[PDB]
Paper text:
pmcThe specific interaction of proteins with the nucleosome is central to the regulation of chromatin function and dynamics. The tardigrade damage suppressor (Dsup) and vertebrate high-mobility group N ([name]) proteins bind specifically to nucleosomes via a conserved motif whose structure has not been experimentally determined. Here we used cryo-EM to show that both proteins bind to the nucleosome acidic patch via analogous arginine anchors with one molecule bound to each face of the nucleosome. In addition, to study nucleosome structure in the context of active chromatin, we analyzed nucleosomes that were reconstituted with a promoter-containing DNA sequence from a [name] somatic 5S [name] gene.
To assess the effect of the 10 bp linkers on the flexibility of the core nucleosomal DNA in these structures, we next analyzed a sample of the 147 bp 5S [name] nucleosome. In the absence of linkers, the 147 bp nucleosome core particle adopts the closed and open I conformations seen with the 167 bp 5S [name] nucleosomes. However, we did not observe a state analogous to open II, indicating that the flexibility of the core 5S [name] increases in the presence of linker DNA. Notably, most nucleosomes in our 147 bp (∼60%) and 167 bp (∼95%) data sets adopted unwrapped conformations, agreeing with the increased breathing dynamics of natural DNA sequences compared with the synthetic 601 DNA. Specifically, R77 of H2A near the DNA end upstream of the TSS inserts into the minor groove at SHL −5.5, contributing to the stabilization of the DNA around the histone octamer in the closed, open I, and open II conformations.
Author numbering:
A (entry chain E): 39 to 133
B (entry chain F): 21 to 102
C (entry chain D): 29 to 124
D (entry chain C): 15 to 118
E (entry chain B): 22 to 102
F (entry chain A): 39 to 135
G (entry chain G): 16 to 117
H (entry chain H): 31 to 123
DNA sequence: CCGAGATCAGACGATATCGGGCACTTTCAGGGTGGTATGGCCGTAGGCGAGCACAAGGCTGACTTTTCCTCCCCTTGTGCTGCCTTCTGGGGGGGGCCCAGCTCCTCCCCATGCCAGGGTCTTTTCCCCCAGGCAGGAAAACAAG
DNA sequence: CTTGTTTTCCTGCCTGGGGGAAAAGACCCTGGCATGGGGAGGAGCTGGGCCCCCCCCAGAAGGCAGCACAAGGGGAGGAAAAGTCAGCCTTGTGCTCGCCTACGGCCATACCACCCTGAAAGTGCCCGATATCGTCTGATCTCGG
């Protein structure tokens, strides 16, 4: 038995809107954060609370961006979001 | 820890964020755009955080420094001090 | 050695929590967020009143500046009720 | 007696006086400056705690958490406006599904 | 003092649209923009009037307008600072 | 002789983007401002510089809104801006959430 | 005077008194007004160079709000810095979408 | 009778030093006054908050350095701190 | 690709309102002295951040299938644009006036600096009560028939 | 629409771990004393925003022809979605080193308060001159055939 394409997407949406966990993996997120900070200042140290704060800010920003891009894609009479939708969303909000 | 770390927010993770964002169908070109968006945002915030740290005559990027950096960009973060 | 003691709004947050809903607990992070909330609104209204006074050229920040800063920084219903409660509290402070 | 007890405020009126003085917000700080402002902070905290406890009870939980806090903030229209550019840590997102992306 | 909003005529909204790079305009754009301008003016007038009442003045001044629009992020140059 | 539909619109776009006048009528914009301030307070006064400030800001605000609604219209496989385009622009900018 | 000694054109004394009487902090340093005056002088000169260049390109010898607004909205860094200021009497930059272009 | 202080005498002179050929209209000059009365208020205030965060009560020139480094884009910062520090050194030496 | 038609651009006569210069004053930066107090430097401990094995199992990468979506083309019809004409109010001028905004003097009432002492605020222990795991049961959609 | 098939919420049971109460320190809150300074109130002036009247002409308003683009329908293809399998690396546990942030102490020099002084900006008035109005041509883009 195979589910109709789409219903597991809706199940994922519901399951992932009912939860308050964090979706990116901590170790690669921390590695990326340290790499980014390396350019600003070589050989820095990073508090665990600081890196967790960065994750909980970045993921929320991404969620908001995805919601607005979904609104754009729906406006374009679609269900699929696209880089065009992402670009329009950013260019309108001012980023 | 020095190179090729942007490929750590994997396609399943971006899919998780998007499904939290209400997206049902996701184009295959969305992942490499969301990665870049996150990279630019993190640059925007970590620059200010590192500037706060280096001004404070310190060496450890602190939670208060990160919160200040987010506060300047209109990204007030609740829970980590203030 | 002794370390410099930290300071917070936690006792007053606990009292207001036990006054509004005396049956539901609160987490450590649900305490940090509320501390951030109270101090952020404190800073916002203080800055608004400061700029108001400096524009009006009044050297002392008073209930007038605080009330108008609340009216300018909070959206309608929150501003109205915050102004009302602040006024009723300042009346008691003036009297008692 | 103490200023907080005088007006019934649960808030440190004297500490708010200190913060106003040392905050460099004005060369002089009035005596209504901390009573009024502590009343404002106390009322706003009372409202957000009320709605957050309601959100907690909606999930059969007796421990208020960031989830319930942000549920209250993003469900009440007015407080979302007040805290629009504010990010709550580990709170989730509001559950929304657009009408177009639904089974027919 | 009634329905001054209609004073913003269809030609004027078309002028603004052509300034904004609009090539073709529907028939409901005019009423939508009338509502939008009414809301924005309500916000800015609220802030400026509150400034004036704090100053206890009876006139609305350019400096009050600049401050009210600065507090909303729409900082206004040229007319004081 | 008549012009094709659109060639007048583009010329009006260029002629106005090259210009800098206040595109709305001053006297009834001022009357609109007075009517709006009426509910906030009775018998208000208005400095001429203040009302000119308000108009010079509102015009720029509407022009920005009309270059964002235009981008929405171009996004939705169209050349005509629509009320739905206005609503999408305002939702994504953050005026009504 | 301090302005003559340091070569600064903007009023070092005036900015020092503005810093001191504006209730920013208890004390104000002695390199603070030099630094702030230099910053404002350079930034206003940066705006003026572009504004004058724009005026010259149109064979006009009088700077106007339209010219300054054009300079702001055209220069990339200055556009980011003054990203949300509504310059009175500025208009907008000529820019038409290609899809509406024939 | 009352008098008003502005930045006009200085703005006109820096104009006559950078572009010594053309002048300023009244409205443009008011624009410039509002601009240099806006960046000033940004930098002084944000340096004040830097001093508040570092638990100080003195706006040293290092606060203004950091304030420029935070409120300006990249090249704007590189070209503003340069002038600030150069002027600071000239002031004593 | 051909010619008519409407539109946009330059430029010289001319003009007046506006930008620049001159003289006074009038406020306000600046020099000198005294003094402290916030801050810079040295000492020291300590607590938390960096580097490191060890699984293991949930999670990620990858290949198949199909299925429902995206995208291009046809067509219509319908509201949108372009042009002409009526007439109407925006705009410029001219004057009056009336209340409202800015100044200045007084002096007093509330805000400011300091004393001492305790009462509220802060850090440490502890436990039990509420969050958490988890296996089984019933309810719930789902999709091929 | 019946019925098989996965998914999801519920619940009883036990566990665990960290929040709410108790214990003592600590550090600055409130009353009280002496004070000086900014604002509340009350003339005084004066100045500009409200109000009206009048004339003109340019722009809104309404309609009519006609037209080209928004929207619905059709159809092919192709690329996400759901499913399954192998491998891998996140992380929860437990550990070691060390070094960087902070608290304390000492003093030190540079910025605050306070008096004179002259000097640079704010004010008002006058001179010239520069962007602008008008109209004649010249250049340019547009549209039917």
């Amino acid at each position: 038995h195979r589910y109709r394409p789409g219903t597991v997407a809706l199940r994922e949406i519901r399951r992932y809107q009912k939860s308050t966990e964090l979706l990116i993996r901590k170790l690669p997120f921390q590695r990326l954060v340290r790499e980014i900070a390396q350019d600003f200042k070589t050989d820095l140290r990073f508090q665990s609370s600081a890196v967790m704060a960065l994750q909980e800010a970045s993921e929320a920003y991404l969620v908001g961006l995805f919601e607005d891009t979904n609104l754009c894609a729906i406006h374009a009479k679609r269900v699929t979001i696209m880089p065009k939708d992402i670009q329009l969303a950013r260019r309108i909000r001012g980023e | 820890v020095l190179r090729d770390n942007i490929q750590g927010i994997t396609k399943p993770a971006i899919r998780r964020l998007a499904r939290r964002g209400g997206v049902k169908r996701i184009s295959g070109l969305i992942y490499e755009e969301t990665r870049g968006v996150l990279k630019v945002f993190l640059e925007n915030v970590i620059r200010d955080a590192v500037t706060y740290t280096e001004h404070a005559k310190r060496k450890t990027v602190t939670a208060m420094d990160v919160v200040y950096a987010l506060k300047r960009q209109g990204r007030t973060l609740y829970g980590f001090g203030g | 050695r002794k370390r410099s003691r930290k300071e917070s709004y936690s006792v007053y947050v606990y009292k207001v929590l036990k006054q509004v809903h005396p049956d539901t607990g609160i987490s450590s992070k649900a305490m940090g967020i509320m501390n951030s909330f109270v101090n952020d609104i404190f800073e916002r209204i203080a800055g608004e009143a400061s700029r108001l006074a400096h524009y009006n050229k009044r050297s002392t920040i008073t209930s007038r500046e605080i009330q108008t800063a609340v009216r300018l920084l909070l959206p309608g219903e929150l501003a109205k009720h915050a102004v009302s409660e602040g006024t009723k509290a300042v009346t008691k402070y003036t009297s008692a | 007696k103490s200023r907080s007890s005088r007006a019934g405020l649960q808030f440190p009126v004297g500490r708010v006086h200190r913060l106003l003085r040392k905050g460099n917000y004005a060369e002089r700080v009035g005596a209504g400056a901390p009573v009024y402002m502590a009343a404002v902070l106390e009322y706003l905290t009372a409202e957000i705690l009320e709605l957050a406890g309601n959100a907690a009870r909606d999930n059969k939980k007796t421990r208020i958490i960031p989830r319930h806090l942000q549920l209250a903030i993003r469900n009440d229209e007015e407080l979302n406006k007040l805290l629009g550019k504010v990010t709550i840590a580990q709170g989730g997102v509001l559950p929304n599904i657009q009408a177009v992306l639904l089974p027919k």
